[PDB]
Amino acid sequence: IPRWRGFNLLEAFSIKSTGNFKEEDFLWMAQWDFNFVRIPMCHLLWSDRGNPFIIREDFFEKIDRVIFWGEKYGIHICISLHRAPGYSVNKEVEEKTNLWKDETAQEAFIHHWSFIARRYKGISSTHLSFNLINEPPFPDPQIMSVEDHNSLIKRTITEIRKIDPERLIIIDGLGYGNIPVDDLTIENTVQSCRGYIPFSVTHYKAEWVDSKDFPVPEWPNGWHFGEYWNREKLLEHYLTWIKLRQKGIEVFCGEMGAYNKTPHDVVLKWLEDLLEIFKTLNIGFALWNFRGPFGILDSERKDVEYEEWYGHKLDRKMLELLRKY
């Protein structure tokens, strides 16, 4: 199958999301030759904080439409749990339980994946894959050991595959999607890495991370938690990732990009280096937004001369960069 190139769509991402995805997103990205979307979902949109086994199945009509649009536009759909019982990197709501340790949270997690597996059974893996959980933390036995992660992921896959043996599963790396998971030699899986290194470029002035002391963005030699990064250091990083292929595991970058307070020249210089490594290493990518601050449209950068695109504002230079690679 061809390398995945595309975007994340965020209409089911937050407790305040409506689940109303835009068919125009699919039409536009198809016309620009992209072939992939990831859909990070918040389980509280169809569940309950008190009872994690609740599923309001009508919500999934919204996701059905997305999967329908994928087939129609030639866009692979990867549906993801951005929040699940006991886990989210999103701080908008605090999980009272810890998925990585809590037996009940884990049963609820599998219960949700089982419902989804049953709903979409018989949609081929060419059209639809499952990304079980977004961005698990760094291992720390106090929260999540490597073995807590691996046992849960294996159990979950086992259940999904009892329902749908051929279902392709995407597994995020540890350390928020940055560390390859070495003991998950499971057939028909992809591990998902990240394209946010270095944070002084991609997350400069980001409100939801502790960014106050980040240095001014620069590339090369951008700063990431005390270390300086260049093209060479990126290359070595992703070269480590693709060793997973020696184990028969594919690799893909499920989120990438830079926020909208970094100067446009720094973003494009960094992005091109990254994209060039990806193309060279045959690593698929997904930009964190299509429309939005990390995206090519309506990104609200104060230093971009936007192009009019059907009433939206298009960053043509960033778009053309993506289409080149």
Side-chain angles (χ1 to χ4, degrees), residues 1-15:
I1 68 151
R3 193 171 61 123
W4 289 334
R5 306 169 53 268
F7 302 89
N8 289 250
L9 301 168
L10 266 56
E11 283 69 26
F13 161 87
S14 139
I15 62 161

Side-chain angles (χ1 to χ4, degrees), residues 306-323:
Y306 288 94
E307 180 188 311
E308 202 272 346
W309 187 261
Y310 297 94
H312 294 254
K313 283 186 197 289
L314 174 57
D315 184 349
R316 171 67 63 173
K317 269 203 257 273
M318 181 186 290
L319 169 64
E320 286 317 309
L321 186 52
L322 292 163
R323 297 169 75 188

Side-chain angles (χ1 to χ4, degrees), residues 145-161:
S145 68
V146 173
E147 224 288 296
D148 290 335
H149 173 274
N150 294 1
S151 56
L152 183 52
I153 291 292
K154 292 173 175 163
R155 287 197 296 125
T156 299
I157 295 182
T158 296
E159 291 304 302
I160 290 162
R161 292 184 172 167

